[PDB]
Scaffold this motif. Structure first.
Motif, PDB file in Angstrom:
ATOM      1  N   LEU A  27      -9.453  -2.302  12.747  1.00  0.00           N
ATOM      2  CA  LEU A  27      -8.775  -3.527  12.338  1.00  0.00           C
ATOM      3  C   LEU A  27      -7.978  -3.347  11.056  1.00  0.00           C
ATOM      4  N   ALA A  28      -8.309  -2.341  10.254  1.00  0.00           N
ATOM      5  CA  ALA A  28      -7.564  -2.021   9.045  1.00  0.00           C
ATOM      6  C   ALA A  28      -6.184  -1.433   9.317  1.00  0.00           C
ATOM      7  N   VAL A  29      -5.838  -1.171  10.577  1.00  0.00           N
ATOM      8  CA  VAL A  29      -4.447  -0.915  10.929  1.00  0.00           C
ATOM      9  C   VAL A  29      -3.609  -2.154  10.651  1.00  0.00           C
ATOM     10  N   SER A  30      -4.175  -3.329  10.924  1.00  0.00           N
ATOM     11  CA  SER A  30      -3.416  -4.566  10.803  1.00  0.00           C
ATOM     12  C   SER A  30      -3.158  -4.934   9.350  1.00  0.00           C
ATOM     13  N   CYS A  31      -4.098  -4.644   8.463  1.00  0.00           N
ATOM     14  CA  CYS A  31      -4.038  -5.155   7.103  1.00  0.00           C
ATOM     15  C   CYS A  31      -4.100  -4.022   6.086  1.00  0.00           C
ATOM     16  N   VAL A  32      -3.158  -4.023   5.159  1.00  0.00           N
ATOM     17  CA  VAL A  32      -3.199  -3.112   4.025  1.00  0.00           C
ATOM     18  C   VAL A  32      -4.140  -3.681   2.968  1.00  0.00           C
ATOM     19  N   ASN A  33      -4.955  -2.813   2.378  1.00  0.00           N
ATOM     20  CA  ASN A  33      -5.960  -3.239   1.414  1.00  0.00           C
ATOM     21  C   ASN A  33      -5.473  -2.970  -0.005  1.00  0.00           C
ATOM     22  N   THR A  34      -6.349  -3.190  -0.982  1.00  0.00           N
ATOM     23  CA  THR A  34      -6.042  -2.905  -2.372  1.00  0.00           C
ATOM     24  C   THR A  34      -7.053  -1.933  -2.947  1.00  0.00           C
ATOM     25  N   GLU A  35      -6.753  -1.469  -4.158  1.00  0.00           N
ATOM     26  CA  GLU A  35      -7.750  -0.772  -4.960  1.00  0.00           C
ATOM     27  C   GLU A  35      -8.829  -1.745  -5.416  1.00  0.00           C
ATOM     28  N   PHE A  36      -8.407  -2.906  -5.901  1.00  0.00           N
ATOM     29  CA  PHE A  36      -9.295  -3.948  -6.379  1.00  0.00           C
ATOM     30  C   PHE A  36      -8.570  -5.270  -6.230  1.00  0.00           C
ATOM     31  N   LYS A  37      -9.331  -6.353  -6.337  1.00  0.00           N
ATOM     32  CA  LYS A  37      -8.791  -7.617  -6.829  1.00  0.00           C
ATOM     33  C   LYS A  37      -9.956  -8.426  -7.371  1.00  0.00           C
ATOM     34  N   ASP A  38      -9.993  -8.613  -8.683  1.00  0.00           N
ATOM     35  CA  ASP A  38     -10.989  -9.486  -9.292  1.00  0.00           C
ATOM     36  C   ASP A  38     -10.390 -10.882  -9.352  1.00  0.00           C
ATOM     37  N   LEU A  39     -10.949 -11.797  -8.564  1.00  0.00           N
ATOM     38  CA  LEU A  39     -10.339 -13.104  -8.377  1.00  0.00           C
ATOM     39  C   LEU A  39     -10.575 -13.982  -9.605  1.00  0.00           C
ATOM     40  N   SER A  40      -9.909 -15.143  -9.604  1.00  0.00           N
ATOM     41  CA  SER A  40      -9.748 -16.148 -10.659  1.00  0.00           C
ATOM     42  C   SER A  40      -8.902 -15.644 -11.824  1.00  0.00           C
ATOM     43  N   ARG A  41      -8.488 -14.376 -11.818  1.00  0.00           N
ATOM     44  CA  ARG A  41      -7.432 -13.935 -12.714  1.00  0.00           C
ATOM     45  C   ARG A  41      -6.087 -14.482 -12.269  1.00  0.00           C
ATOM     46  N   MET A  42      -5.959 -14.825 -10.990  1.00  0.00           N
ATOM     47  CA  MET A  42      -4.830 -15.600 -10.496  1.00  0.00           C
ATOM     48  C   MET A  42      -5.374 -16.801  -9.736  1.00  0.00           C
ATOM     49  N   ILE A  43      -4.682 -17.931  -9.851  1.00  0.00           N
ATOM     50  CA  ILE A  43      -4.956 -19.095  -9.019  1.00  0.00           C
ATOM     51  C   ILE A  43      -3.858 -19.126  -7.972  1.00  0.00           C
ATOM     52  N   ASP A  44      -2.613 -19.065  -8.434  1.00  0.00           N
ATOM     53  CA  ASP A  44      -1.461 -18.736  -7.608  1.00  0.00           C
ATOM     54  C   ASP A  44      -0.699 -17.604  -8.276  1.00  0.00           C
ATOM     55  N   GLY A  45      -0.712 -16.436  -7.647  1.00  0.00           N
ATOM     56  CA  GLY A  45       0.074 -15.331  -8.140  1.00  0.00           C
ATOM     57  C   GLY A  45       1.554 -15.474  -7.916  1.00  0.00           C
ATOM     58  N   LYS A  46       1.940 -16.279  -6.915  1.00  0.00           N
ATOM     59  CA  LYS A  46       3.332 -16.597  -6.580  1.00  0.00           C
ATOM     60  C   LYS A  46       4.162 -15.344  -6.321  1.00  0.00           C
ATOM     61  N   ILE A  47       3.733 -14.528  -5.360  1.00  0.00           N
ATOM     62  CA  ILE A  47       4.561 -13.401  -4.963  1.00  0.00           C
ATOM     63  C   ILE A  47       5.715 -13.914  -4.118  1.00  0.00           C
ATOM     64  N   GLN A  48       6.934 -13.648  -4.582  1.00  0.00           N
ATOM     65  CA  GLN A  48       8.140 -14.282  -4.075  1.00  0.00           C
ATOM     66  C   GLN A  48       9.057 -13.229  -3.473  1.00  0.00           C
ATOM     67  N   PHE A  49       9.531 -13.494  -2.256  1.00  0.00           N
ATOM     68  CA  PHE A  49      10.303 -12.526  -1.488  1.00  0.00           C
ATOM     69  C   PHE A  49      11.782 -12.871  -1.530  1.00  0.00           C
ATOM     70  N   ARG A  50      12.577 -11.954  -2.080  1.00  0.00           N
ATOM     71  CA  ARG A  50      14.027 -12.107  -2.167  1.00  0.00           C
ATOM     72  C   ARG A  50      14.666 -11.184  -1.134  1.00  0.00           C
ATOM     73  N   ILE A  51      14.789 -11.696   0.089  1.00  0.00           N
ATOM     74  CA  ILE A  51      15.460 -10.977   1.165  1.00  0.00           C
ATOM     75  C   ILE A  51      16.938 -11.330   1.151  1.00  0.00           C
ATOM     76  N   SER A  52      17.746 -10.553   1.869  1.00  0.00           N
ATOM     77  CA  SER A  52      19.168 -10.859   2.007  1.00  0.00           C
ATOM     78  C   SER A  52      19.609 -10.326   3.362  1.00  0.00           C
ATOM     79  N   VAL A  53      19.887 -11.231   4.292  1.00  0.00           N
ATOM     80  CA  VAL A  53      20.254 -10.827   5.644  1.00  0.00           C
ATOM     81  C   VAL A  53      21.664 -10.251   5.643  1.00  0.00           C
TER      82      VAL A  53
END
Lengths: 49, 49
Positions: B23-49
Motif C-alpha cells: 500500500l506504500a506504493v500509493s502514498c509517499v511517507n516522511t522522515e518525521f512529522k511531529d504534529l501540532s507544530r502546524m495546524i494548517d501548513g497551507k501547502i499551496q500549488f502554483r501550477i500553470s497549464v
C-alpha cells in the motif's frame, strides 16, 4: 475312476498396516504403551487476537 | 490413572508494517512529522497549464 485333486490353494492373508497406507497422512501417530491408563487427554490453545 | 496434557500451543502475531505491504506504493511517507507544530501548513500549488 481315481479322483485326482490338483492342489489345495489358499488365500494370501496380507498384512495391512495403518502406517503402510496413505491414510496416515490424515493423522500423525504416536506409540503409547499405556493408553488405557489415560482417562482424559487435554490439549490447549491460546489465540492472541 | 492420569489425565494427560498433550502440549499447548499459541499463534505468532504477524508484525505487518505499512511499508511491509504494497500500500506504500500509493502514498509517499516522511522522515518525521511531529504534529501540532502546524495546524494548517497551507501547502499551496502554483501550477500553470
Amino acid at each position: 475312476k481315481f479322483e485326482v485333486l490338483l492342489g489345495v490353494y489358499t488365500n494370501a492373508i496380507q498384512y495391512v498396516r495403518f502406517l503402510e497406507t496413505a491414510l496416515a497422512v490424515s493423522c500423525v501417530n504416536t506409540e503409547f504403551k499405556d493408553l488405557s491408563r489415560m482417562i482424559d487427554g487435554k490439549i490447549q490453545f491460546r489465540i492472541s487476537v
